[PDB]
Amino acid sequence: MSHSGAAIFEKVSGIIAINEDVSPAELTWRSTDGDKVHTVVLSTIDKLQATPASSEKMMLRLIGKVKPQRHMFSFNNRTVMDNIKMTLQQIISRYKDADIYEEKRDSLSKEKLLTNLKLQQSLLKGNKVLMKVFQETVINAGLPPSEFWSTRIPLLRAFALSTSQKVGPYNVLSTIKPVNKVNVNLSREKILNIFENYPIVKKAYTDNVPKNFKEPEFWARFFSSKLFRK
């Protein structure tokens, strides 16, 4: 498999295993007799160091971010080492992106419209000229709020319809193009559209976003997953 194999640590031979189920992922090295055990959390790894394929040695070092922590593993077969290098690269790359992201960061009738105080407050806050009239005519003069909005029904309706309309359905996943390093540009509008067209994505989104990992990691896994292809 690509998640386990033989390795030698500190001149001691043992089995190296890559644990990805537990978040954050950690690498556990277990000695043949089990006398000595070493475990390292992949979140602390800054860079991945691997010996060149042109050298007889087949070592592989995992350097930790800070006297930076250093873990050196010696393998026996290049294919086994290669089978583990690529898998380890995926975990670090996704977590590095997550770390980068973390560091970087009806109601259209006269009755209801005259009764929807939230909408009346919402439109008034944005509008400044209406504040001038409202402040003088309602606060100081004392005109009833209901009477003031009686003659401005079209104004209330126009503002409500702006935020009360939604675009039609469409093939959302087909628009996404991965465009080695490949970059994609998602948007909040795209996120909502994906959920509506594909309830399964929402099902896996609601149950894992706060629990396990941040949204950028979730969508990084989703696109790389076979589910996105399917």
Q: Which residues bind another protein (CB under 8 A)?
A: 5-6, 8, 11-15, 31-36, 47-52, 55-59, 61, 70, 72, 76-77, 79-80, 85, 89, 93-94, 97, 117, 121, 124-125, 128, 131, 134-135, 139, 145, 178, 180-188, 191, 215-216, 219-220, 223-224
Q: Which two tokens stand for residue 29?
A: 């090295």
Q: Collapsing DSSP states into helix, strand and coil, what is residue 179?
A: coil
| Cα separation values, 110 from 103, 116, 120, 122, Å | 49, 10, 13, 17
Rounded Cα distance, 62 and 48, in Å: 5
Q: Which is nearer to another protein, 22 or 182 (CB)?
A: 182
Smallest separation (angstroms) from another protein to the CB of 191: 7
Smallest separation (angstroms) from another protein to the CB of 112: 15
Q: Which is nearer to another protein, 26 or 99 (CB)?
A: 99
- Identify whether 52 is preceded by a cis peptide bond (ω within 30 of 0): no
Rounded Cα distance, 149 and 156, in Å: 8
Spatial contact of 138 and 148, defined as CB atoms under 8 Å apart: yes
Smallest separation (angstroms) from another protein to the CB of 227: 14
Sequence-separated (6 or more) residues with CB below 8 Å from residue 196 = 169
Smallest separation (angstroms) from another protein to the CB of 24: 18
Q: Which is nearer to another protein, 19 or 31 (CB)?
A: 31
Smallest separation (angstroms) from another protein to the CB of 66: 17
